[PDB]
Amino acid sequence: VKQLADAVEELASANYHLANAVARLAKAVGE
């Protein structure tokens, strides 16, 4: 399952990137 774990880690990193972007959009909308 090591390669699946690696893939899940990649997804976690992508979703952190997405959260950061969504937060920036919230800020832009609210300002």
Distance CA 12, CA 29 (A): 26
Residue 22: CB minimum distance to a copy of itself, A: 4
Residue reference for tokens 């899940």 = 8
For residue 1, what is the DSSP state? -
Residue 2-21 contact track with a copy of itself, rule CB under 8 A, x = bound: xxxxxxxxxxxxxxxxxxxx
> Considering only CA atoms, which of 12, 14, 20 is closest in space to residue 28?
20
- Rounded to a whole number of angstroms, the minimum distance from the CB of residue 13 to a copy of itself is 7
Minimum Å distance from CB 29 to a copy of itself? Answer: 4
Task: Give contact residues for a copy of itself (rule: CB under 8 A).
Answer: 1-31
